[PDB]
Design a protein around this ligand. Structure first.
Ligand SMILES: *[C@@H]1O[C@H](CO[C@@H]2O[C@@H](C)[C@@H](O)[C@@H](O)[C@@H]2O)[C@@H](O[C@@H]2O[C@H](CO)[C@@H](O[C@@H]3O[C@H](CO)[C@@H](O)[C@H](O)[C@@H]3O)[C@H](O)[C@H]2NC(C)=O)[C@H](O)[C@H]1NC(C)=O
Ligand code: NAG
Ligand code: NAG
Ligand code: NAG
Ligand code: MAN
Ligand code: MAN
Ligand code: MAN
Ligand code: MAN
Ligand code: MAN
Ligand code: MAN
Ligand code: MAN
Ligand code: MAN
Ligand code: MAN
Ligand code: MAN
Ligand code: MAN
Ligand code: CA
Ligand code: CA
Ligand code: CA
Ligand code: CA
Ligand code: CA
Ligand code: CA
Ligand code: CA
Ligand code: CA
Ligand code: CA
Ligand code: CA
Ligand code: CA
Ligand code: CA
Ligand code: CA
Ligand code: CA
Ligand code: CA
Ligand code: CA
Ligand code: CA
Ligand code: CA
Ligand code: CA
Ligand code: CA
Ligand code: CA
Ligand code: CA
Ligand code: CA
Ligand code: CA
Ligand code: CA
Ligand code: CA
Lengths: 526, 526
């Protein structure tokens, strides 16, 4: 059972709310009789007795009293004495738009993932406008931009708050961060705004792979670089940050020897040899390097290594045929030996010239490159020079040159080209009469410089002035020793001297001979 | 040089050609000149009797020539006595006997989930040791929606097969792929070589954590201790590894939510770290955010409601009391004004009052929660001057709680009792010739009132004697009530006289009582 009065809030103190003396039917003289008083938990109002009307007391701030409540009603009692009575009074106060909507924080900073799907919603803390009705918050709206949208969400249960609807994919390598201005507006005359700034810092995720500076590189090396030689350092650039920017390098899809010879450090990306190179084994290597982050995004490159040749192989002289023993009557230009040269190098380091040392009558003639023949230049002789030590030298054209020599041993075989020569130009022997038959009266001798059969000497009597049927009856000759024998006792009174033609013969093809004349003189006795 | 041409992989003793007829030699002299072959390897052997060239060891063209399109073998023939050398070259024509072949039958690649389309992946090529059209000519691949196959030629001329990607991968849809790569040459019949490529997609942090449902509902009784298991919340990330470990935390919350509740960052489990009260806050809106290391997050809210428990005792307040209370107070007169306050809500905060005992006071409720203590009995201070009215209030919750107060009432006196004489009439005998100024009688009266209202003062208002001589006969002491004789009495003159006294109270207004007194003058002899 109450009466109701209406005023605006924040009203001036001691402003009349209304006269209760008229509404409660109390004479102005009947009233001071009565203690008129206000009973309330917090004294927002008081009454002057002599006045008989209601008076505003303390600060009547609606927002600290009713809060959000749609209608604001202050219930309090009024006490009167003689007779004792309690009257009930409640006042309605109208809302004043004296509070503007304001966000809790001046700046809010969000971390939004780079790969957040579009349309995803991010709830935002709502502003606080303590007024009620139309004077409360009505419209959120955000900075016009292309990346983000704002909408006011109200769940069917009751609570409401604004949220960000993402418009498109983010990309920290395009924009590291954005800053936007959100405005909250209430709906009365005149509207009151409150702004806040949102800074969104995009966080890195893995979407860019390491990339090499070029598709292909090139380096060259001498084939004598020691193990550990820095060949080439490769690097890749990853546009991400954090662990999604760590780069690992590795050999992949390389021949076995390519991986065995070289060595690539995973973290640094530098390539150094681990063993000796050899141009004769591999003229060049090709290299493929894989660079990848932990997210297995990769890019690959190819480095081509071209080795350069060095003069490190000695030329070799191969001799494939030789003429031994060599007959001394061999004509000019006969081919004695077959010569080839092999140098595993390349270019001028493998180009070889061949010479024969000395001038003993042997020269090299070249039919074609690396092919030679060792011919005779002058006539030969075994009794002069029986044996030859022929040195052939091959030399390359590298700087400095590398040489090699070989020694061929030629033996000269005997040809029957020397006739036997008698020790004396003629022979003359003195045999005394009445000599014993079958004794040594003389001994011819010859000499032959040839070897073996071509130097074996046989002696024979070819002619004499005596009766041919009686020659053997007089003297004879030993074919093996040359000693001459008498086969009958000589008689001076019958014949004093006789003539003999002795012959020296060898055993060759053909046989060579020589004639000597021996005269036998028979001494005289009785 | 003599040029020939034969197919590879011919059987031994096969005739290549008759060099006796081709060199220009004579078959009569072929036995004397050893015809022989000098060469690096014993691929061939001539017969000196027949003078022809036989194949020796197997001549595998791919074991000699390799990459060279046309392959020639150059070897020498030595003669002897006469001694010469002859140059021959045999062309090895290619027989398609080698098929394309891969180093590994199965290759395993790791491709990140976010390789942009068109990214080329260079694969290990196939080896076709043949040359010409019989060498490798094209690559083919299983028809799928994700990968195409190409063959790229570096300007150097090295050819390699690279894969091209046409559609974004997704391991949450297809963890890995199995493909078939074939290599085809250009002979008839064409020989093919296959390999199986198992491509494995690597996890990339592309999916955010997500909750079962956006809003949860729980209720808590307000008397739960600190540390009560409120709720456990979990989220599921569709990724793997470090990309799928979750961190939960509060997000845009009131200070009180952070002071009362403790949420495990690792478990998503909320408990309370303080005591709750229903009268302070009836509900709590919690906002939880679950985020992965990539700052991808989803948000849910837990709307907690609080249950009221009866813990506030009801309070009785006596706004005003009416004491002292006049004993002439009519019925239904208001004594004390009462109000009731219980901070609980519902039946726990619904208070009702009643008076203990029965002594003439009843509680009439003008409105809900307000009482007037009125009288239903006429009071009398001479009977009961003090009252100790005990008022009790209780609530209708389970279990209920009550409280009492003791009002003390003092009863004000009112002059509501006139004095009464202890006797109805007075008859007094006086002897004759009594001394003037002697006590003849004494009257008495009583008044139960308090103080001046109970003070009695006597007087003689009237008598039958002439009023001028009344002062000469009798008198009364107003304090003691004694009736004295003011003269000597003579029986022969007057035998008896009557009298009319009054007993009066002193409080205003005065209450009086009249009494009659008869005086008989006794008779002596004079
Ligand atoms: C109305 O009630 C009052 C107060 O009663 C108080 O509360 C009750 C629940 C009981 O527990 C009472 O014992 C308690 O005092 C009564 O007044 C009280 O009366 C008693 C007895 O007459 C007084 O006791 C005296 O106390 C003093 C010391 O203060 C001693 O020296 C005395 O020897 C004697 O023990 C008590 O003081 C008094 N209290 C007050 C505040 O006056 C009252 O009698 C009662 N009236 C009726 C009609 O019931
Ligand atoms: C040839 O050389 C060998 C080896 O030293 C030697 O024994 C021989 O006497 C030499 N002959 C000539 C003729 O120089
Ligand atoms: C030696 O004598 C024989 C026989 O009379 C003769 O044929 C020859 O010419 C002579 N001279 C030589 C040198 O042999
Ligand atoms: C007592 O008597 C006097 C005179 O006779 C009279 O006026 C008075 O009213 C009487 N008392 C009462 C209580 O009536
Ligand atoms: C917000 O916007 C209002 C108009 O809607 C302005 O009046 C105010 O100053 C604030 O900028
Ligand atoms: C909201 O935003 C504006 C800038 O748009 C500030 O000037 C203002 O103080 C509040 O931070
Ligand atoms: C190793 O070191 C050499 C210099 O010594 C560099 O030229 C090379 O690129 C690699 O870094
Ligand atoms: C090159 O030098 C060597 C010695 O180092 C000789 O043996 C060779 O004959 C040529 O002169
Ligand atoms: C035999 O003996 C004689 C000596 O009487 C020599 O003169 C002769 O030459 C042969 O030796
Ligand atoms: C590879 O492909 C060829 C046809 O190009 C077939 O002949 C062979 O059997 C293999 O399938
Ligand atoms: C290549 O593919 C074939 C089937 O097409 C297999 O049989 C072979 O072993 C290789 O995996
Ligand atoms: C503690 O235990 C309760 C059940 O007793 C759960 O509901 C809560 O989520 C927490 O795990
Ligand atoms: C009021 O009533 C409650 C029970 O409702 C009691 O516990 C209390 O002592 C008082 O009598
Ligand atoms: C005065 O005294 C006499 C006795 O002396 C009493 O009889 C009389 O009633 C009054 O008290
Ligand atoms: C009359 O006198 C008696 C004593 O005799 C008192 O008790 C009474 O109150 C009245 O005054
Ligand atoms: Ca205000
Ligand atoms: Ca306001
Ligand atoms: Ca406002
Ligand atoms: Ca990016
Ligand atoms: Ca990366
Ligand atoms: Ca990135
Ligand atoms: Ca070398
Ligand atoms: Ca070399
Ligand atoms: Ca060399
Ligand atoms: Ca000679
Ligand atoms: Ca000779
Ligand atoms: Ca000779
Ligand atoms: Ca073959
Ligand atoms: Ca072949
Ligand atoms: Ca083939
Ligand atoms: Ca995915
Ligand atoms: Ca993923
Ligand atoms: Ca994830
Ligand atoms: Ca409580
Ligand atoms: Ca409670
Ligand atoms: Ca309660
Ligand atoms: Ca009374
Ligand atoms: Ca009284
Ligand atoms: Ca009285
Ligand atoms: Ca008398
Ligand atoms: Ca008398």
């Amino acid at each position: 059972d109450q009466i109701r009065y209406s005023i605006p809030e924040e009203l001036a103190k001691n402003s009349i709310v209304g006269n209760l003396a008229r509404d409660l039917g109390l004479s102005v003289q009947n009233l001071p009789t009565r203690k008129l008083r206000v009973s309330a938990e917090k004294d927002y109002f008081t009454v002057n007795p002599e006045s008989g009307d209601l008076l505003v007391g303390d600060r009547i701030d609606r927002e600290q009293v009713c809060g959000k409540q749609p209608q604001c009603v202050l219930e309090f009692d009024i006490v009167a004495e003689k007779p004792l009575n309690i009257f009930h009074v409640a006042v309605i106060l109208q809302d004043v738009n004296d509070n503007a909507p304001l966000f809790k924080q001046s700046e809010v900073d969000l971390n939004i993932g780079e790969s957040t799907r579009p349309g995803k919603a991010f709830p935002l803390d709502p502003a606080l406008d303590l007024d009620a009705g139309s004077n409360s918050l009505q419209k959120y709206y955000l900075t016009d931009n292309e990346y983000f949208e704002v909408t006011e969400k109200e769940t069917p249960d009751g609570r409401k708050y604004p949220e960000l609807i993402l418009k498109r994919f983010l990309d920290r390598e395009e924009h590291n961060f954005h800053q936007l201005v959100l405005t909250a507006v209430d709906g009365g005359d005149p509207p009151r705004s409150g702004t806040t700034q949102i800074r969104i810092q995009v966080t890195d995720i893995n979407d860019n792979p390491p990339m090499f500076s070029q598709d292909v590189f090139s380096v060259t090396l001498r084939e004598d670089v020691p193990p550990g030689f820095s060949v080439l350092q490769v690097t890749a650039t990853d546009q991400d940050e954090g662990v999604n920017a760590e780069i690992t390098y590795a050999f992949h899809n390389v021949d076995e020897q390519v991986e065995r010879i070289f060595n690539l450090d995973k973290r640094t990306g530098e390539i150094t040899t681990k063993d000796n190179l050899d141009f004769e084994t591999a003229k060049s290597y090709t290299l493929n390097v894989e660079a990848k982050d932990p997210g297995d995004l990769a890019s690959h490159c190819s480095i081509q290594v071209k080795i350069l040749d060095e003069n490190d192989c000695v030329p070799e002289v191969i001799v494939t045929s030789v003429f031994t023993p060599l007959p001394e009557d061999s004509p000019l230009g006969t081919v004695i030996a077959l010569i080839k040269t092999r140098d595993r190098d390349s270019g001028e380091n493998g180009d070889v010239y061949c010479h024969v040392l000395g001038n003993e009558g042997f020269v090299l003639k070249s039919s074609s490159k690396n092919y030679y023949k060792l011919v005779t230049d002058r006539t030969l002789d075994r009794e002069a020079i029986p044996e030859y030590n022929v040195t052939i030298v091959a030399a390359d054209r590298g700087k400095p040159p590398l040489s090699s020599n070989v020694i061929i041993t030629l033996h000269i075989s005997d040809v029957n080209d020397n006739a036997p020569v008698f020790h004396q130009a003629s022979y003359l022997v003195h045999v005394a009469e009445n000599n014993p038959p079958g004794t040594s009266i003389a001994q011819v001798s010859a000499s032959d410089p040839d070897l073996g059969s071509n130097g074996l000497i046989s002696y024979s009597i070819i002619a004499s002035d005596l009766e041919p049927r009686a020659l053997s009856s007089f003297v004879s000759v030993n074919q093996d020793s040359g000693v001459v024998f008498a086969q009958r006792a000589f008689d001076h009174e019958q014949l004093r001297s006789f003539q003999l033609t002795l012959q020296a013969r060898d055993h060759g093809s053909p046989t060579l001979s020589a004639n000597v004349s021996m005269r036998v003189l028979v001494g005289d006795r009785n």
